[PDB]
Amino acid sequence: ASVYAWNRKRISNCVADYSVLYNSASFSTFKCYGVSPTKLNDLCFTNVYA
Amino acid sequence: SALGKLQDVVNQNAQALNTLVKQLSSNFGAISSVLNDILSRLDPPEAEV
């Protein structure tokens, strides 16, 4: 989507492996706030929005 | 009410303890009042703050 009309995807009721994304060589930016990127797989959330 | 003088002492101390316990639920500016939640989410460089 264009940034003025950004696209929101709701994620729920699933297993979230964030190491697949974090340990990827294909991303130039991966900045986490309020949470450490290496502790994400130890956490549970009530919802994730992408 | 005859023994109010003794009951007041009990009430004041019980109240002080209850207040002290309740303060553990305050964030004081932190993301969470729960120490374990901070430690489970953040690494030391940020957790310590």
Side-chain angles (χ1 to χ4, degrees), chain A, chain B residues 2-49:
Chain A
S2 302
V3 71
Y4 91 94
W6 48 275
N7 184 33
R8 169 158 282 192
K9 170 69 175 177
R10 185 191 292 269
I11 297 168
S12 67
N13 296 310
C14 58
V15 179
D17 186 344
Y18 296 100
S19 292
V20 171
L21 298 171
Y22 185 69
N23 291 329
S24 171
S26 299
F27 301 119
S28 65
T29 300
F30 203 120
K31 295 179 181 178
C32 296
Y33 305 88
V35 65
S36 171
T38 61
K39 293 192 173 182
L40 289 170
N41 282 351
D42 290 334
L43 302 173
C44 293
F45 307 111
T46 61
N47 215 259
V48 180
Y49 295 100
Chain B
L3 274 67
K5 288 183 178 181
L6 298 178
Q7 188 63 50
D8 285 346
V9 173
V10 172
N11 290 347
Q12 288 171 349
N13 288 281
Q15 185 177 64
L17 288 170
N18 286 336
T19 300
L20 181 63
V21 171
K22 287 177 183 178
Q23 287 298 99
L24 292 170
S25 299
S26 294
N27 287 339
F28 302 111
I31 60 172
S32 180
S33 70
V34 179
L35 186 59
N36 287 336
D37 288 344
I38 292 167
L39 292 168
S40 72
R41 286 165 57 173
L42 302 176
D43 280 340
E46 289 84 42
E48 289 181 2
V49 173

